C-alpha cells in the first residue's frame, strides 16, 4: 500500500504531466516501441511506422498517447482505490488486445524514463520510488484480473 506521502509525490509530478499530455504520450509510446519492437506488432494501426521520425509525425499515434495517459491518470488519482477504473482495462487488454503483463512492465519503464527527462526537479529519487510503487500496484492488480480470466500475462 502506498502511504499518503508517497501518493502526494506521484500526483505532484502527474499534475505536471497533465500540462502536456500529448507530448508526454508521444515520448512514452515512441520509447516503448523503439526499446521493445515486439510491442508495436500489437497495433495493426501503427505497424506501418518504421522510423522514429514517422512515429513523431503520426497524429493517430499522438492521439492514442493521450488515450493511454488519460486512463492512467484517472487510475492514479484514485490512489489505490481504483477497482472500477482498472477492471474494464484489464478485461480488454487480456481478452481483446492480448497484451502480456510483461509489456505493462515495459511501458512502466518508459513512463519512468520520460518523467525523469522532462521533470528532474519534481522527479528525484523519492518521487521515482513512489512512482515505481504506484505502477507496480497497477500491474499487480491487473495481473490478478488476468489470472482469474485465464491469461496471467
Contacts of 81 (CB under 8 A, 6+ apart): none
Residue 87 C-beta: closest distance to ligand HEM, Å: 11
Closest distance of CB 142 from ligand HEM, Å: 9
State the nearest-atom distance from the C-beta of 67 to ligand HEM, in Å: 5
Nearer to ligand HEM, 95 or 121 (CB): 95
Q: How many CA atoms lie within 13 A of 146 on its CB side?
A: 19
Residue 12 vs 42, nearer CB to ligand HEM: 42
116 is in an annotated binding site: no
Which is closer to ligand HEM, CB of 77 or CB of 121?
A: 77
Q: DSSP letter at 74?
A: H
Q: How many CB atoms lie within 10 A of CB 52?
A: 12
Shortest separation between residue 125's beta carbon and ligand HEM, angstroms: 22
* Comparison of 37 and 121: residue with beta carbon closer to ligand HEM: 37
Instruction: List the Cα angle 71/64/143 in 5-degree steps.
Output: 45
Phi, psi of 47 (to 5 degrees): -55, -30
Q: At what angle do helices 59-76 and 83-91 cross, to 10 degrees?
A: 140
Contact positions vs ligand HEM (CB under 6 A): 39, 42-43, 45, 67-68, 71-72, 89, 92-93, 97, 99, 103-104, 107
- Strand, coil or helix: what is 109? helix
The answer to whether 36 is annotated as binding is no
The binding site for heme b comprises 93
Positions at the binding site: 64, 93
Annotated binding site for O2: 64
Amino acid at each position: 500500500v502506498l502511504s499518503e506521502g508517497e501518493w502526494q509525490l506521484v500526483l505532484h509530478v502527474w499534475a505536471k504531466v497533465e500540462a502536456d499530455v500529448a507530448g508526454h504520450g508521444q515520448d512514452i509510446l515512441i520509447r516503448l516501441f523503439k526499446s521493445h519492437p515486439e510491442t508495436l506488432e500489437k497495433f495493426d494501426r501503427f505497424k506501418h511506422l518504421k522510423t522514429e521520425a514517422e512515429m513523431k509525425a503520426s497524429e493517430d499515434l499522438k492521439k492514442h498517447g493521450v488515450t493511454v495517459l488519460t486512463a492512467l491518470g484517472a487510475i492514479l488519482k484514485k490512489k489505490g482505490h481504483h477497482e472500477a477504473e482498472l477492471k474494464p482495462l484489464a478485461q480488454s487488454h487480456a481478452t481483446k488486445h492480448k497484451i502480456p503483463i510483461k509489456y505493462l512492465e515495459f511501458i512502466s519503464e518508459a513512463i519512468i524514463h520520460v518523467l525523469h527527462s522532462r521533470h528532474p526537479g519534481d522527479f528525484g529519487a523519492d518521487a521515482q520510488g513512489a512512482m515505481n510503487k504506484a505502477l507496480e500496484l497497477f500491474r499487480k492488480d491487473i495481473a490478478a484480473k488476468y489470472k482469474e480470466l485465464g491469461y496471467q500475462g
